[PDB]
């Protein structure tokens, strides 16, 4: 029905660092979008089709911490700026959109849903523009169509005087492509 | 800590809903009247009384959070009832929308004041009243969120 989201924090700075190094994450996993961090940075990773995806410009070739030690990427496509690990035990996966709608909804790291109008294959504009600091940490977040299906992954922002009006995204089809 | 955007409210006789939008807890004049809302510091007076639009608002209470006004102009709405059921409503005009799937009158009883959400879960309006044909509700009247926005100036 309507898209609504909530955030829960599962680790603090100290625990994250230890975990980054041990590469062992024992915590249970839930939800469709994971909030992820490195040493320098935080972003989002979306689970689509059993795979947890995010942007390359954040994850690099990095492994993901898991209950069984580090886990290696399953897909790495530098040109697409896409990376994927097998989706954690207990996450849930988004369905790729097939309605071709132009009314998009970006899900931010603060668990807000913001309207976005499609204007191309890989670009959309914010109906209510926002401060760039608000979108900070949201790269990798999903863009849903009105049925809550994944249309794409937020990749980059077009900002002007610190205010963001459009967002570039990796479209789901590029995921499927990357999957072959 | 978990905050609610929708409050289930009562007067001595009736029981209905209130929705928090922009820091104001809004509901229907036909349920609240000019009443004050309770608080642990004693009664709190309405910030807004708009008899014309069937609208009333107090400051958002504690344990509450605000909904964002819809800005996507969509027509696929969702009504939330006091039982937390969600029912799709297709928007007809400014203040009216029709159920996609009609329900007995009582299924909506006590839900006025509740929100009508767009696909983003942003607030499109407050459910104002059930439009009935012999015990069956097939549509709804609502206060458009813009009325609330303008009432604020």
């Amino acid at each position: 029905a309507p898209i609504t989201a909530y955030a829960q924090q599962t680790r603090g700075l100290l625990g994250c660092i230890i975990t980054s190094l041990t590469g062992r994450d024992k915590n249970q996993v839930e939800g469709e979008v994971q909030i992820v961090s490195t040493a320098t940075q935080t972003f989002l990773a979306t689970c689509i089709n059993g795979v947890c995806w995010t942007v390359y410009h954040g994850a690099g070739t990095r492994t993901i911490a898991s209950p069984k030690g580090p886990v290696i990427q399953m897909y790495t496509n530098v040109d697409q700026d896409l990376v994927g690990w097998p989706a954690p035990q207990g996450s849930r996966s988004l369905t790729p959109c097939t309605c071709g709608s132009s009314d998009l909804y970006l899900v931010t790291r603060h668990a807000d849903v913001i309207p976005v109008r499609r204007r191309g294959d890989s670009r959309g504009s914010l109906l209510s523009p926002r401060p760039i600091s608000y979108l900070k940490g949201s790269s990798g977040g999903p863009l849903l169509c009105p049925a809550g299906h994944a249309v794409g992954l937020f990749r980059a922002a077009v900002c002007t005087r610190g205010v963001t009006k459009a967002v570039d995204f990796i479209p789901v089809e590029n995921l499927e492509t990357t999957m072959r | 800590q978990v905050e609610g955007e929708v409050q289930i409210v009562s007067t001595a006789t009736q029981t209905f809903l209130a929705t928090c939008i922009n820091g104001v807890c809004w509901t229907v004049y036909h349920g609240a009247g000019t009443r004050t809302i309770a608080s642990p510091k004693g009664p709190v007076i309405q910030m807004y009384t708009n008899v014309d639009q069937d609208l009333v608002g107090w400051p958002a209470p504690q344990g509450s959070r605000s909904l964002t006004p819809c800005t996507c102009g969509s027509s696929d709405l969702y009504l939330v009832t006091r039982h937390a059921d969600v029912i799709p409503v297709r928007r007809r005009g400014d203040s009216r929308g029709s159920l996609l799937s009609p329900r007995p009158i009582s299924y909506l009883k006590g839900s006025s004041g509740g929100p009508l959400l767009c696909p983003a879960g942003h607030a499109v309006g407050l459910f104002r009243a059930a439009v009935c044909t012999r015990g069956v509700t097939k549509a709804v009247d609502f206060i458009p969120v813009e009325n609330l926005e303008t009432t604020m100036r």
């Binding site: 898209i3 829960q8 599962t10 975990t19 994450d25 469709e32 909030i35 990773a45 | 978990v2």
Partner: peptide, 21 residues
């Protein structure tokens, strides 16, 4: 080089609920 770490999650599939007392 460090592993990427899950530090939190966003849940899309939760639906409206009455807050338990």
């Amino acid at each position: 080089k460090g592993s990427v770490v899950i530090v939190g999650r966003i849940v899309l599939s939760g639906k409206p609920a009455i807050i338990p007392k």
